[PDB]
């Protein structure tokens, strides 16, 4: 054949891949965390958007930290061989490096480590996209007039 350049990920596998959306709106009262009004708007918008890109969208609402970890472990153990890519969207409270389950925090690294190239071999070489709507601390940006 002609010249081959390999500058773009192969996105013509049979399936685009999974789009897992974790939508945490309501937190256990014990945690002190507020309900996240507007997050269902986000989750619905994402489902539509990723549906139109031909992802297999799976939504989960109001997961505990243990449920988040179980979900990601289970998803990482699926056979992704026929999938081009993987997307995970996290909608929750957060701090730098942390996302909240409904009962407490999860380190983001614990979640992403399931998808490392050595631990999820059917995603090795494939793009793994994590979209994170959560705080990363407490700083506020005052902006500048342009």
């Amino acid at each position: 054949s002609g010249i081959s350049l390999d500058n773009s990920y192969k996105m013509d596998y049979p399936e685009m891949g999974l789009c897992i959306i974790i939508n945490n709106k309501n937190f256990h009262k014990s945690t002190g965390m507020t309900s996240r009004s507007g997050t269902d708007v986000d989750a619905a918008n994402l489902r539509e958007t990723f549906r139109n890109l031909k992802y297999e969208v799976r939504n989960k609402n109001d997961l505990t930290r243990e449920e988040i970890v179980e979900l990601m472990r289970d998803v990482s153990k699926e056979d992704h061989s026929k999938r081009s890519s993987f997307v995970c969207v996290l909608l929750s409270h957060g701090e730098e490096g942390i996302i909240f389950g409904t009962n407490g925090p999860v380190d983001l690294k614990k979640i992403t480590n399931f998808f490392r190239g050595d631990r999820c071999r059917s995603l090795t070489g494939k793009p793994k996209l994590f979209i994170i709507q959560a705080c990363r601390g407490t700083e506020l940006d005052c902006g500048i007039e342009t």
Partner: protein, 103 residues
């Protein structure tokens, strides 16, 4: 040329390669959400994917998301501490190729 650290016989990639993290906000900062319309970031992300996913590489789409969030939104709060604030999303790419959602 020749050296100790290139041209391995057995090809490996980093285990951290081929991840992209599309964060809603810069490191250390709050992220903003409208209780009626959704988060600034997700609203903007979905709008830019709807418009551009059949046309632009993903980093370029995310750059348009950055611009939209940065320019179009500013907080409103009855609390002066939290009023008139801004947000810039933060794209963290460990990708090794261009990503197009189409082929």
């Amino acid at each position: 040329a020749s050296g100790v650290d290139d041209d391995m016989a057995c090809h490996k990639i980093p285990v951290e390669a081929d991840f992209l993290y599309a964060y809603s906000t810069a490191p250390g900062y709050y992220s903003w959400r409208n209780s009626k319309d959704g988060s600034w970031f997700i609203q903007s992300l979905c709008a830019m994917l709807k418009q551009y996913a059949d046309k632009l590489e993903f980093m370029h789409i995310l750059t348009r998301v950055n611009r939209k969030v940065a320019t179009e939104f500013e907080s409103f709060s009855f609390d002066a501490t939290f009023h008139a604030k801004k947000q810039i999303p933060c794209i963290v790419s460990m990708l090794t190729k261009e990503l197009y959602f189409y082929h």
